[PDB]
Curated annotation (Swiss-Prot), chain A:
GO-annotated cellular components: DNA-directed RNA polymerase complex
Pfam families reported in the protein's UniProt record: RNA_pol, RPOL_N
Species whose genome carries this gene: Escherichia phage T7 (Bacteriophage T7)
Effect of residue 600 to L: Partially inactivated
Disulfide bonds: none
Highest classification ranks of the organism: Viruses, Duplodnaviria, Heunggongvirae, Uroviricota, Caudoviricetes
A GO molecular-function descriptor: DNA-directed RNA polymerase activity
EC number(s) per entry: 2.7.7.6
Name the record gives this protein: T7 RNA polymerase
Entry-linked PANTHER family: DNA-DIRECTED RNA POLYMERASE, MITOCHONDRIAL
Regulation of activity: Inhibited by the product of prokaryotic viperins (as well as the human ortholog RSAD2), which make various 3'-deoxy-3',4'-didehydro-NTPs, suggesting these modifed nucleotides act as specific chain terminators for this RNA polymerase.
From Swiss-Prot, chain B:
Active site residues of this protein: 481, 565, 734
Name the UniProt record assigns to this protein: T7 RNA polymerase
Source organism per UniProt: Escherichia phage T7 (Bacteriophage T7)
MF-aspect GO terms: DNA binding; DNA-directed RNA polymerase activity
Gene3D superfamilies the record matches: 1.10.287.260, 1.10.287.280, 5' to 3' exonuclease, C-terminal subdomain, DNA-directed RNA polymerase, N-terminal domain
Catalytic activity from the UniProt record: RNA(n) + a ribonucleoside 5'-triphosphate = RNA(n+1) + diphosphate
Length: 840, 805
DNA sequence: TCGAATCGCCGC
RNA sequence: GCGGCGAU
DNA sequence: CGAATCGCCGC
RNA sequence: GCGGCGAU
């Protein structure tokens, strides 16, 4: 209800405590220590204010039970209510006479569901008319709504196709409106048994809630009952109050939670070097200390305390030390255009389907608001730190070891954020620096599928356009028309500077180089796949290699062959419909024209574990369904048959193109499945080998543990929200994408330390496979990122090491099931050193 | 005043809510209640022990020694210490012992006076005496080289007065020499010593509120209360132990404030590392070991009960030099100490004498060696072993009777002869064994043996077989011990054939005495050394005795297995030629001088040093694998513990690193010896976070070999239980025992596990794989290579009868 | 019978 | 958890 | 200066 | 921590 302010004493400690102050002051002076500790203090202040506004809205909406401060108490009272429900039902049955008027109503709703519906609706009613009648009414109408529309949910098979559309709607009235529509539809089909719901009358609903209110006072006792003006027929009223201890418990938990949810901001001094698991980054001893590894359990964090990973610690601290500053020139442009357009680069002037169209505009209206709120935060943070000579971002890691910045405004964000951020410590650009400055500008414009010589040609041909954009960014919109506009505009400014000030010009712009498909690149390196490696530019090639265009080419080759040969159409009975043959289906697709657009997402999702089944849903939504809406797709007479046909063709094309990827992810999936199973002798039933997690260690020395854990029980209501064992399926789903991500994290970490030690590089722009530095150091970073990758996969056999980790854990029945290690290929790793387009 | 945790807290250990039916359905309610009563009582008994100890410290002003008073003192010392220097600055600013010691001496003397004259003068006068006592005596400490010699004698002295008498005598000897300065101690003015006191008191009240303040008095009390609850006197189980399914909670069934831990670790973090580890075979061994059902040998107990009332030690004295006078004092302390342990062991054995079976929970140390949890357990002294026998029995049979005879002759001490002789000794004394069994009080022959109570328990069973034939059921454990487990294990992994004969690992016609082997080699050097030796040369001026001259004395005295004996048992523990020279003097040169012999040794230390290099050289050629291994593991640990810094920069390339290895059973062990950066020691008063390089080096070789034998023991019990019917195991770290019928099968199993493990695993190479990445670029050139494999075949091990393991 | 990557921000 | 945004 | 572990008792 | 005893 009412929460005392954390801020007055406990946030005051952040600036007061001497040991955090002295440690900061010794490194960077008292005054930078003053600013940093006050800034970290404000970060905690902003975070507490964030909680208070959300709590106020949730209290107003009756959604306090949804808030985290109210979840712990509800978990305690819920069993007591349920037990009292079940006993009441048994006690009412035992007694003889007319059954109480709520008995029948309470029965169709699950005893768990009534329990939560009463607690939430009573908490909603009390925190937002305390009379028992209004709350009993409010309970009853909620019980009936779960009763009437629940019938649809459990029926179930049809509900699975209406489940998503229910979720896509926001707000109870919209959820209820949609459910009245489906109920009418399914009643017309006769699915619900043809039984139209007879609405409860008001006096019934009142009696439903009162029995619930009584039942909580006996069992739980949070609410208590009070009678006003007893014995007077006019004013005899009964009222409901919350137990103060329970209100104090949410209030204590609300305050406890507000002090541990800061809004992290950039540092005005270099971030605190990591010496251990906790307390890196920000310098204050804080209520929410940073962790080196972002984990879901304290235990998975504790495993890292013992481990000796000097190279992991060095890489994070080097990355933290990178000095950034706000690009004021970009910020000047963004401050203007943002006031005029919701998205500044969105609409530049330049020279059943209806139901699906309505869903699109609804999503578009959501997307506009969500996009703009992120924009407003980034600009405000950018304008805040604009006048600082440098700022710094702390770094930590996810549980797989990938590196992420900690502050909400960070260099790993969207274009506008990336454009608003530049490095602080620049060097004179030089001939080689100018060259990569133009290559970077070419990539920001979207000229990336072309060799470097034509990338330079594109920049130099558009010299006058680039110059005009830098001189008047508001008068020439050409930069906004580019693929990465603000980052392109950032290049335009530095390009203009080099021409004004020559090659002596000091440029501090981050020149990002990104691996084309890092997962397939890594998988191709492990098993030495030549064909896969060439497709992802691991091996030197005549031109840049587009894996989508390659797969599209192989798809089109099948289509042309399946147009001359291939099955005729046939008629199949279904519970008679025509089943289109491959010859018909090929003709439809050739009529559409299959490009890299048709195959792109399928290749991207390959590292995530997607296969032929998942491609059909991709193909339908990405190309076929938009084609029908556009008035194309007359060829797609049966859309699902076309998608399934094309998904087969994409999967065959992908698997023969990158064999190492397909084989390696299968081997890891088989490993996790065996380890995640419980081994029980069928006759005895006893479990011989328990369910086991998956663990490996990166060549960088980062350990990682995959323990996806499933909760035992869960509850779900239609209109109100729902409120450990190893999850074997998530273990198999996650093992291959997580393993390859742990490798690219090690590659990134090994790159920054190698670029820092062999070469002089001190500034790093890092987005998981994108490696950036100032132009003067661009050539060496290009060198460094290739040298690391060749070294690890010459030094280490990551899959064989992985096998050595879990081979002991395997049970004797499982060993025949385990596949062998995939065969190595003919690729030579030293060709990666001379590969122009790997970028990594 | 200490609150009684026992009232509410020892109801929590009872845990009379976790269904005792969990125990009661499987084993019966009375036994379940008794077990829960026993664990409850075990916690109560320990609390009473703490209280009696605490009171005695209270009477003697020793509360500052007690752990309950420490955590305040460590909080209050630096605030005090800061205030000492603050006045030191103020007095230095205005013209008009260590600071830590002044703080510690003030706090201890004040707390003692209040614990046991509350006047401000009386305490300051006592505090003034201690500071003056520290200054005069501390001059000897800070001189220092001679202090290193007298330090050991101060440590042997006990009681503030008795250390003072010694330091008084040494100061005279130093001064009658003149070593401390010739300046006698200048006695503090009695009014100045009270002035120093008052001054230190006044600082204490300003720095801390302790002067005693109530909050500090309840802090000792609440901590003392918590410490009485976590120190139980563990008792044997009357039901089978709870199987270990995890890191904690095994063994005893009751939920406790101090649950059992699978691995005994000094740090909670070291225990936490074992939770993630999957070691199924380690868990099996502990659970089968816990499942062994024991019974108290009543016949042994009746004999023990009477002789313990008549003799301080039942078997010590049977009717059949100033340093020496210090030793008889030690014997008087010895005679006491054994009696307290004896009386408790008798008390427990009588307490459980009527139970049809008792069980012992098990856990392990950080090296993985398996220890029984109860204070009364089968890993005790000869009388404790004799009081305990297995409950499960099988008819003895011809094979079992043979091993019963073999066990008896080992208890008699005939363990250096072949098995047919060991058999023969028994029937030669067959009439004496009967008489000992028939009337143990009338015949004292059983007490004369090397392991009398075990030999008496053998006498009872040997009589029992003769009464009822081979049909008679015997449940007595028959323990067989490897001659030297460390040398055996080291010789196997490096395939040293020469070592294997010495430890009887190879099949041999006769038992091999490794002490005899090294001694014969020493004699051979000594004989040659008389023929060729460095001449005596004179380097006051003293003549150094030539190697031939030193040989002549040693040859006149002679060298026997006993002289070499220690240097090889110490060798597994890591002792070296430097260490050897002392022990040779103490064991062989010192008793000769008391005997009147040692006339030949003109200089004892010259003989000890000359001897020392002869055992070490003879040891090195006798067991080359054991020496060659131990250097490699030590060399590794030294590199891991060292810090690598850029010589000019000092920036640390590699931190001090602990060493880690995994036993073939899968038990992991991490060796992290840690040394505090600062420590305070006072001469007259009690003494009060980096890897310790010397401890890491000193410990790695013996700790590694212990982890292997524990892995072997754990492997042996699982192998013996699964391949063979054996369900009852008597285990003492390398001694394997079972009922006589099952002995021959365990006799087989202990070989098979040892052979199978070293054929399958190269343990030292695996150890390299663990620290290989940790080694720095400078260290890799320094690191020695792995010692070479030898020509020993491990298939010979299963054939040897004398290895016993 | 079922199902068909990680991290953050905002909203409920 | 659900809805949307963004990063790889 | 620097020459095994685990218990119990005592200080 | 130091001293004594025991197990290996």
């Amino acid at each position: 209800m009412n929460t005392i302010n954390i801020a007055k004493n406990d946030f005051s400690d952040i600036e007061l405590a001497a040991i955090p102050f002295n440690t900061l002051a010794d490194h960077y002076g008292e005054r930078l220590a003053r600013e940093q500790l006050a800034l970290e203090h404000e970060s905690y202040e902003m975070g507490e204010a964030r909680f208070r506004k959300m709590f106020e809205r949730q209290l107003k909406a009756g959604e306090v039970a949804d808030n985290a401060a109210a979840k712990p108490l509800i978990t305690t009272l819920l069993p007591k209510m349920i037990a009292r429900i079940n006993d009441w039902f048994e006690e009412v049955k035992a007694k003889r006479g007319k059954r109480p008027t709520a008995f029948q109503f309470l029965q169709e709703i699950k005893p768990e569901a009534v329990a939560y519906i009463t607690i939430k609706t009573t908490l909603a009613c009390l925190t937002s008319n305390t009379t028992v009648q209004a709350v009993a009414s409010a309970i009853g109408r909620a019980i009936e709504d779960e009763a009437r529309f629940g019938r649809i949910r459990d029926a179930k098979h049809f509900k699975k196709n209406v489940e998503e559309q229910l979720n896509k709607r926001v707000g109870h009235v919209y959820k209820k409106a949609f459910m009245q529509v489906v109920e009418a539809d399914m009643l017309s089909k006769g699915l619900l048994g043809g039984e139209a719901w007879s609405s409860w009358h008001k006096e019934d609903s009142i009696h439903v809630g009162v029995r619930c209110i009584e039942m909580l006072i006996e069992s739980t006792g949070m609410v208590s009952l009070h009678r006003q003006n007893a014995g007077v027929v006019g004013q005899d009223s009964e009222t409901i109050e919350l137990a103060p201890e329970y209100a104090e418990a949410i209030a204590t938990r609300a305050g406890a939670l507000a002090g541990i949810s800061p809004m992290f901001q950039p540092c005005v001094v270099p971030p605190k070097p990591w010496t251990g698991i906790t307390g890196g980054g920000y310098w204050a001893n804080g209520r929410r200390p940073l962790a080196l590894v972002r984990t879901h359990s304290k235990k998975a964090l504790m495993r890292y305390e013992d481990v000796y990973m000097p190279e992991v610690y060095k890489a994070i601290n080097i990355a933290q030390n990178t000095a950034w500053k706000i690009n004021k020139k970009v910020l000047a442009v963004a401050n203007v255009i943002t006031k005029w357009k919701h998205c500044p680069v969105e609409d530049i002037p330049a020279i059943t389907a209806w139901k699906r169209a309505a869903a699109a505009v609804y999503r578009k209206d959501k997307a506009r608001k969500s996009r703009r709120i992120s924009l407003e935060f980034m600009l405000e943070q950018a304008n805040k730190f604009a006048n600082h000579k440098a700022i710094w971002f702390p770094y930590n890691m996810d549980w797989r070891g990938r590196v992420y910045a900690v502050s909400m405004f960070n260099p790993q964000g969207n274009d506008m954020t990336k454009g608003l951020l530049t490095l602080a410590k620049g060097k004179p650009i030089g001939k080689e620096g100018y060259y990569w400055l133009k290559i970077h500008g070419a990539n920001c414009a979207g000229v990336d599928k072309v060799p470097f010589p034509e990338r330079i040609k594109f920049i130099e041909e558009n010299h006058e356009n680039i110059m005009a954009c830098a001189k008047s960014p508001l008068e020439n919109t050409w930069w906004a028309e580019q693929d990465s506009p603000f980052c392109f505009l950032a290049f335009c400014f530095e390009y203009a500077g080099v021409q004004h000030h020559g090659l002596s010009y000091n440029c501090s712009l981050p020149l990002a180089f990104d691996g084309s498909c890092s997962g397939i690149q890594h998988f191709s390196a492990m098993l030495r796949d030549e064909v896969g490696g060439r497709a992802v530019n691991l091996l030197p090639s005549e031109t840049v290699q587009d894996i989508y265009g390659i797969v599209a080419k192989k798809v089109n080759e099948i289509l042309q062959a399946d147009a001359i040969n291939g099955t005729d159409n046939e008629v199949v009975t279904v519970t008679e419909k025509v089943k289109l043959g491959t010859k018909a289906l090929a003709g439809q697709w050739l009529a559409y024209g299959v490009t890299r657009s048709v195959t792109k997402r399928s290749v991207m999702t390959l590292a995530y574990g997607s296969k032929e089944f998942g491609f059909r849903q991709q193909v339908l939504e990405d190309t076929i369904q938009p084609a029908i809406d556009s008035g194309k797709g007359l060829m797609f007479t049966q859309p699902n048959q076309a998608a399934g046909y094309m998904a087969k063709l994409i999967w065959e094309s992908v698997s023969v193109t990158v064999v190492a990827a397909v084989e390696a992810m299968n081997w890891l999936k088989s490993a996790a499945k065996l380890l995640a199973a419980e081994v029980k002798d069928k006759k005895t039933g006893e479990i011989l080998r328990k369910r086991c997690a998956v663990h490996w260690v990166t060549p960088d020395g980062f350990p990682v543990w995959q323990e996806y854990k499933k909760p035992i029980q869960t509850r779900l209501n239609l209109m109100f929200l729902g409120q450990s064992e190893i999850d074997a399926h998530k273990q198999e789903s996650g093992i291959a994408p997580n393993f390859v991500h742990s490798q690219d994290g090690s590659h990134l970490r090994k790159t920054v330390v190698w670029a820092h030690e062999k070469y002089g590089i001190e500034s790093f722009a890092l987005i998981h496979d994108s490696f950036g530095t100032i132009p003067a150091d661009a050539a060496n970073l290009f060198k460094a990122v290739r040298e690391t990758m060749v070294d690890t996969y010459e030094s280490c056999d990551v899959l064989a090491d992985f096998y050595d980790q879990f081979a002991d854990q395997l049970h004797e029945s499982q060993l025949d099931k385990m596949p062998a290690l995939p065969a190595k290929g003919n690729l030579n790793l030293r060709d990666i050193l001379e590969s122009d387009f790997a970028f990594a």
